[PDB]
Design a protein around this ligand. Structure first.
Ligand SMILES: [Fe+3]
Ligand SMILES: [Fe+3]
Ligand SMILES: [Fe+3]
Ligand SMILES: [Fe+3]
Ligand SMILES: [Fe+3]
Ligand SMILES: [Fe+3]
Ligand SMILES: [Fe+3]
Ligand SMILES: [Fe+3]
Ligand SMILES: [Fe+3]
Ligand SMILES: [Fe+3]
Ligand SMILES: [Fe+3]
Ligand SMILES: [Fe+3]
Ligand SMILES: [Fe+3]
Ligand SMILES: [Fe+3]
Ligand SMILES: [Fe+3]
Ligand SMILES: [Fe+3]
Ligand SMILES: [Fe+3]
Ligand SMILES: [Fe+3]
Ligand SMILES: [Fe+3]
Lengths: 159, 159, 159, 157, 159
């Protein structure tokens, strides 16, 4: 019971942690003049914030008390020295959002909490699409960057 | 007091000097068949002329006498043998426009000339955006030109 | 700063003093059948009251207490005998308004009151425009009035 | 090529004229002739467009252009009334016309039919311009015979 | 006199010869799967036909008898083994159209035939723009083809 409350609460922190990692990725791309990839990251930073606010709003409706935790400093921007490194961290970040949601669904399932299971369904399916989209961008970036300059030519055109 | 008059007057010459450097860059790019970069430079040549005319118009309103100086021949087109060289001179040129405006703001500040400080504010912020935009283009051009031909393929698509 | 609060209060008084002086000019012009110059003066009497109202609204928001002072009786109308005299008094009035504003900005700058200085900026620039416009009308009035009846032909035309 | 040199000098002459027009705009604004000031500011932008048109044709025709300094205007020092300013501007347009005719004579000697064709609309624009300027100068010279009267007509044009 | 008739007549053959060379270039590009460059050539083939018909129409109006000559087989498509070779032949072809028009203008000039000189003026200026545009495309193609594959990537995007 309490475990469900705790995992709901942790989900909000995970989505806001992901919002800040995406903002860090936007900064790294703008600082290195990848304005197209920076705008994509900034849009995802706002979207993850929206995911967190949806969990807050449902929790309030369901009388699940939310206590906002610290949103950790992103520190993957330590590692990053090329756009591949940034997109690989973003892929790992979406995988962690997916695992957080599955853990939460498992707790709900154990509790027979059908309303929380229902609420999570569109997020499970969102995550499938997000991991697919980021996986695909990572593949494109890794392939284009085999030729000097070429990756730039595709921040400019796409994004 | 007089120093403020002189620096106002010099600002007009700096913006018209920059207008002519951008026209020289347009010529170098058209002569070398970079029609996209040439059209960007020609647009900036007109914009710097507009900055100079705004300083003339304010000076007339504020009874700061303007005496138009010679606009020097651009001679950076000596150096240029690749688009990187052109964009690097343009970056240096915007940095000199920014320094000219800051010197002018310092004189105004010393004189407690609040109207001239206010007038300069949108130009300080314009310059921040211009140095950022030219820095970013220079980075893109330097990276694309690591592969023969590739830079061309992006005059054509962007610009 | 007592100085800064008093000068803010004084600025409201100066804008309302100027409103009344413009209304006095409108009466002189209407009495002497210069209906075009009267309507100009009436529009400016309303604009200077809007300036004073702008200062009262910002003072209220910034917790600057406003004590409304008397708006003195205009005295120049006792001595005006031609349009040139009236326009010369309005130029002087505008020069006063600008001095009052620069005094207030000097007090704000000493107090490092960044918000008050930022509020004043559009008024600094408006005064450059108003002094230029009045000085140019005064110049046209003074030249046209060298031929009998010619200035009348220009209240009728412009205004 | 004296042809090449004259084509470069034409760019410099148009930008020289742009600056002389801007200097006339400033003398008029300083002296509260805002109407005549706006006419000269428009001409200053038009002359810069004539120079840009020359640069563009030279780039297409592979005529190398090397931008020269644009000399500071000096006729403002002597102006004391609008008639002086307008008289300098008529002299400036006569100089622009002469520069175009010198370029056209070299193109004709060279049998450069493309450059002669390119110049034709500029020869006709100069006729129109010298006419308009000579007409305004005549109107200003006549109106300024009565004190104040010229002013009364800046404000109405 | 007769020389003017002959050179008018030869101009029609030159424009129709150029129409067929452009059609040959379209075929070579379609056969080698350069559909963007093929469509440009086909458009120029129709345009040169239009230039020839304009000369026919003026000649009819001016009572210059036209006798249509054989339009020669294009045989530059012998040489061609890369798009650079095609564009270089097209540049040479526009240079020959320009020379044909200048020869014709010289004959008209000698004859003091002011109507034929006037008629040719827009064609002299068309040619300046055409040689500039083809020169520029040739430069782009020669530079892009320094990297395998890259030129293709710009038939697809431009054209
Ligand atoms: Fe997302
Ligand atoms: Fe997304
Ligand atoms: Fe999320
Ligand atoms: Fe996500
Ligand atoms: Fe700019
Ligand atoms: Fe720009
Ligand atoms: Fe500038
Ligand atoms: Fe700039
Ligand atoms: Fe006002
Ligand atoms: Fe006003
Ligand atoms: Fe006021
Ligand atoms: Fe006022
Ligand atoms: Fe003109
Ligand atoms: Fe001109
Ligand atoms: Fe002109
Ligand atoms: Fe064509
Ligand atoms: Fe074409
Ligand atoms: Fe043709
Ligand atoms: Fe052609």
């Amino acid at each position: 019971s309490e475990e469900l409350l705790d995992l709901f609460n942790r989900q909000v922190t995970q989505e806001f942690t992901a919002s800040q990692v995406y903002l860090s990725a936007s900064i790294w791309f703008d600082q290195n003049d990848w304005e197209g990839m920076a705008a994509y990251m900034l849009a995802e930073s706002a979207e993850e914030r929206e995911h967190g606010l949806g969990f807050v709003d449902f929790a309030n409706k369901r009388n699940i008390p939310i206590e906002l935790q610290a949103v950790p400093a992103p520190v993957s921007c330590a590692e990053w020295s090329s756009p591949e490194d940034v997109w690989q961290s973003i892929l790992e970040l979406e995988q962690a959002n997916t695992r957080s949601l599955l853990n939460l669904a498992e707790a709900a399932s154990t509790c027979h909490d059908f309303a929380v299971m229902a609420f999570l369904n569109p997020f499970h399916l969102q995550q499938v699409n997000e991991e697919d989209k980021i996986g695909s961008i990572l593949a494109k970036v890794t392939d284009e960057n085999r030729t000097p300059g070429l990756l730039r030519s595709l921040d400019v055109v796409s994004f």
